[PDB]
Structures are given as C-alpha cells and as structure tokens.
Amino acid sequence: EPPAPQYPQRGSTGPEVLALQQRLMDLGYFILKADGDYGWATQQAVWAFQKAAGLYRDGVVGPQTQAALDAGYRPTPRSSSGKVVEIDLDKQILLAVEDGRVVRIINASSGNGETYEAKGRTYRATTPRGDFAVYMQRDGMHSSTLELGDMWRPKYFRGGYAVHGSSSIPTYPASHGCVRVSNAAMNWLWDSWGMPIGTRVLLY
C-alpha cells in the first residue's frame, strides 16, 4: 500500500523536483530557480532536456529521463569558435554556444511547415536552414509580418525571421517560421549572455 515513486512532472512539488531543477541548472538547461515547484519555467527546461536527449517529450521524468539526467546529457554544438546561436530544428532547441562549448540549452519552437495566408498571399511556414547573423533587433513587444501574435524582444537573422520570446513554446514546431523561446530565456540572451548585432545564428 506504500505509494510508488514520484516521477517529477508539471504540478509536482518536493525534494525530487528541487533536485531535478538543480541538475538541469548545473547541466546548462535554462532555468532560473530551484525551488521545488514544477511550474511553467521548469517545464520549459524539462522539455529542452528531453528534446536534447532524444526522449519522448512528455515532461514526465521517468526512468529513462532520469538515466539521461544521471548521464549528464548535453548536446554537442557544431561551431568551434566564438559566440554562436545554434538552432537544432530536429530537436527543437536553441543552443547559446561560446568557443565550441554549450553555455545554455533553451527550449524552442520553429515553423510548422504548413501553409498560411497573409496580406492576401499563401506562404509556407518553413524556418530556413543555414548560416545567418543577427542584423536588427527590436527591444520590446512587436508585431510580425510572419507570425500572428506579437514577439518579445526579437532578434532578426533573415528578413522577418527572428528569435523571440513567446507565450507558448510547445514540444512540436508551432510557428509560421520564427524561432520562439520563453520571455525569460530571451531576456537572458539579451541582458546576461549578450547576443549583439552581428552574432552568428546557425540553423540545421
């Protein structure tokens, strides 16, 4: 009649959640607080972890996810030098990379690949693959020609294609093509890490 273990998941609280949050933090998955409550922010970090590790993206830290946590799984970046934002489209993560070392792994969501209509024309919600650079930024909440909602602190890398904060960053590609991250992650990129004009943005 004793209860089985807790698998940390959204809504959980307790020491095991605290330990998970700290381990994520230690491994570089973006999370600000280890407080023992598995809320929205923790969800973003768990999803980033499961994505990175190639695991089913359910937010539930069961036996397989725990094994990967214990193994200390971190993705290997493609770049070798300098500051680079890498976006892994298959895994749906953004990597803040410096000198070939991942500094942070951030949950992301990119284009859904479906058609959409805008100012009377049909487009396809593809995120481009390639080697680009931040060329402009708008430091507040702004509208998009591509995206339907507003974008928080966009950093533009090819025409209207930007990395930005969003209210929803799901476990599948959900956008019209821009790359969404949490507002907190976007603030970190801007204000703590620094991602100035000219920063390489590599998508693959």
Task: Name which position in 13, 19, 25, 62 contacts Cl ion (CB under 5 A).
Answer: 62
Nearer Cβ to Cl ion (51/155): 51
Q: Is 11 in the site for Cl ion (CB under 5 A)?
A: yes
CB–CB of 138/197 below 8 Å? no
Annotated catalytic residue, options 178, 186, 202, 203: 178
Name the minimum Å distance from CB 43 to Cl ion.
7
- Residues between 104 and 163 with contacts to Cl ion, criterion CB under 5 A: none
| 50-58, 90-98, 177-185, 190-198 -> range binding Cl ion (CB under 5 A) | 50-58
Distance (Å) of CA 112 to CA 105, 123, 177, 191: 21, 12, 7, 29
Annotated catalytic residue, options 51, 104, 153, 164: 164
Instruction: Give, as one character, the DSSP assignment of residue 127.
Output: P
Q: Is 6 in the site for Cl ion (CB under 5 A)?
A: no
Q: Give the DSSP letter string of 63-114.
A: HHHHHHHHHT--PPPS--SSEEEEEETTTTEEEEEETTEEEEEEE-B-B---
Task: Name which position in 12, 44, 65, 144 contacts Cl ion (CB under 5 A).
Answer: 65
Nearer Cβ to Cl ion (40/204): 40
Task: Name which position in 6, 56, 100, 196 contacts Cl ion (CB under 5 A).
Answer: 56
Nearer Cβ to Cl ion (31/203): 31
Neighbours of 104 (CB within 10 A): 21
Name the minimum Å distance from CB 65 to Cl ion.
4
The continuous run of DSSP H or E covering 136 comes out as strand 136-137
Instruction: Give, as one character, the DSSP assignment of residue 193.
Output: I
Whether 142 sits among the annotated catalytic residues: the reply is no
CB–CB of 127/110 below 8 Å? yes
Whether 1 sits among the annotated catalytic residues: the reply is no
Distance (Å) of CA 102 to CA 26, 60, 77, 86, 97: 12, 24, 7, 9, 4
Neighbours of 167 (CB within 10 A): 10
| 22-30, 64-72, 120-128, 140-148 -> range binding Cl ion (CB under 5 A) | 64-72
Name the residues annotated as catalytic.
164, 178
For Cl ion, the binding residues (CB under 5 A) are 11, 39, 41-42, 56-57, 62, 64-65
